[PDB]
Amino acid sequence: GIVIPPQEQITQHGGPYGRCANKTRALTVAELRGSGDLQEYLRHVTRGWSIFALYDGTYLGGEYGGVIKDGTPGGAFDLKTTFCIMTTRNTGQPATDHYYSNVTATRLLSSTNSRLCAVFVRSGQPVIGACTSPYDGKYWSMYSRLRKMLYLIYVAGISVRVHVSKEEQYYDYEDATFETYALTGISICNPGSSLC
C-alpha cells in the first residue's frame, strides 16, 4: 500500500528549478497516479505545450493529453517548474491518547526548519511515525526534553513505548506506507510496570 495525500494541500506557485519553499516537498509520480481530484485539478490549468517534471518522472500536459512517464530519481529538475506540496494538516479530532507498546526507532529525517521525524519498527515492519519541531505546533515546548531521549534510544537501541497524539498529520516522507502524527511522550518500562 501507499499513503495518498489529499488535494487541498497543493501550492499555487511551484518551485523554481527544483527548490521548493520551506516546509514543503516535491510530489511523487506514484501519488499522482492514484488520485482523481489531483489529476482533474492538474488539467483545466496547464495549457499550451507546457511540460512539467516530477520527483521520479515526467509529466506532459496541455495539448499532450496528460501522459505520465517514469524516470530516474531527481533526473529532471532542470525545468522551470516543479510541483510542491505542503506537509502539515489539521485534523480537527479531539486530544486523544494512544500508545503502541514495543517499538524500535529505525530512520531519521530532517531539513531546514521543519522538524525531526523517526520511524518505529516491530519485527521488521513499520508501525507509526512521530515528529517534533521547535518552530510550530501545539507541543513545541516539549522539544528540548524529548530530543535527549530520542538521541539516547537511537544510539543505544533501547526498546521503548511511544505516546503519540493524532491531532496533526504530517507527510514529510516520500511514498510512505504508514501514518505520521505528533510525538507527545516516551517511556522505558519493565513488563507490567505501572509508571508507563
Epitope: 495518498i4 506514484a30 505520465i68 517514469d70
Partner: antibody
Framework: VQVVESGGGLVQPGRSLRLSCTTS????????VSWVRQAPGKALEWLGF??????????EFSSSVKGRFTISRDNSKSILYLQMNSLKIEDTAVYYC??????????????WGQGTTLTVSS | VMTQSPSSLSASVGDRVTISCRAS??????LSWFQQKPGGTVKLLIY???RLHSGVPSRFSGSGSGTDYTLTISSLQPEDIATYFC?????????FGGGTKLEIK
C-alpha cells in the same frame, strides 16, 4: 481466496437494491474492492473503488454516476455493499466484484467472482 | 478510447497465434490482459507489459512499448477457447477493450 456476490433478481424503474459481496481468506482492512459491469455487447465498464484503512476508506467513482451509487464497508463481517438509486431502463448487466493489488508503482485487479444477474423490466 | 483487431481469429493444435492490442496514445507500459471463459468466469493473465501472474501457464507471453502491445501463445490447446480483452491504468478512469474471440475449426 474466495469472492462471491449475492443479491439481485428483478427490479422496476425507481426501485433501489443493495448487492452483497462477501469475501474470505485475506485481511479485509488492507486491500481495495471494485465493481465492474458487462452490459450486452462486452465493453466492460469500471465504476468505482473503496480505499483501505491507512487512507481512511475514501471513495472515487467514474463517469457521471456521482450522486447515484455509493459504497460502504462492514469491517467486522468482511461484507461490502453496493447501493443503487433509480435504476435506468438500460442498467441490465452482470455485476462483478474484484480485488485490487498494488505492485511496482501502479495498480491492477487480481481475483474475480462468479457474478450476479440483474434484469430490469417494466 | 481503445480498439483491438482482429475481432475473431481461428487456428488449430500446435498453431502459434498472436493477438494485437493498442491504445490512443502512449500509456507507459500500463496494459493488462484477461481471459473470459465461455460462461461466467474471468481470470487475469498479464498485468504489467511483460510480467506474468502466478498460476498462468508459461506458454503465454507478452511484449511491447509505446502504443503497440501483443500477446503470444506458444501452442494452442482445446482449453484456450475464450474471449480476451485489454485494460490500461495510466490515468483515471480505467477503460477496457472491445474483445477478441478465439475459435477452432
Amino acid at each position: 481466496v474466495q469472492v462471491v456476490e449475492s443479491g439481485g433478481g428483478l427490479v422496476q424503474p425507481g426501485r433501489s437494491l443493495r448487492l452483497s459481496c462477501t469475501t474470505s481468506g485475506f485481511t479485509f482492512t488492507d486491500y481495495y474492492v471494485s465493481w465492474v459491469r458487462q452490459a450486452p455487447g462486452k465493453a466492460l465498464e469500471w465504476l468505482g473503488f473503496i480505499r483501505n484503512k491507512v487512507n481512511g476508506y475514501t471513495t472515487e467513482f467514474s463517469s457521471s454516476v456521482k450522486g447515484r451509487f455509493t459504497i460502504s464497508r462492514d469491517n467486522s463481517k468482511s461484507i461490502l455493499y453496493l447501493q443503487m438509486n433509480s435504476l435506468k431502463i438500460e442498467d441490465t448487466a452482470v455485476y462483478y466484484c474484484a480485488r485490487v493489488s498494488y505492485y511496482g508503482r501502479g495498480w491492477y485487479f487480481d481475483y474475480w467472482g462468479q457474478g450476479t444477474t440483474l434484469t430490469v423490466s417494466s | 478510447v481503445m480498439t483491438q483487431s482482429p475481432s475473431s481469429l481461428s487456428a488449430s493444435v500446435g498453431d502459434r497465434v498472436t493477438i494485437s492490442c493498442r491504445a490512443s496514445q502512449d500509456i507507459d507500459n500500463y496494459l493488462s490482459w484477461f481471459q473470459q471463459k465461455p460462461g461466467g468466469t474471468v481470470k487475469l493473465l498479464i498485468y504489467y507489459t511483460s510480467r506474468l501472474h502466478s498460476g498462468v501457464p508459461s506458454r503465454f507471453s507478452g511484449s511491447g512499448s509505446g502504443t503497440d502491445y501483443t500477446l503470444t501463445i506458444s501452442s494452442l490447446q482445446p482449453e484456450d477457447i475464450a474471449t480476451y480483452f485489454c485494460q490500461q491504468g495510466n490515468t483515471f478512469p480505467w477503460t477496457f477493450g472491445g474483445g477478441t474471440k478465439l475459435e477452432i475449426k
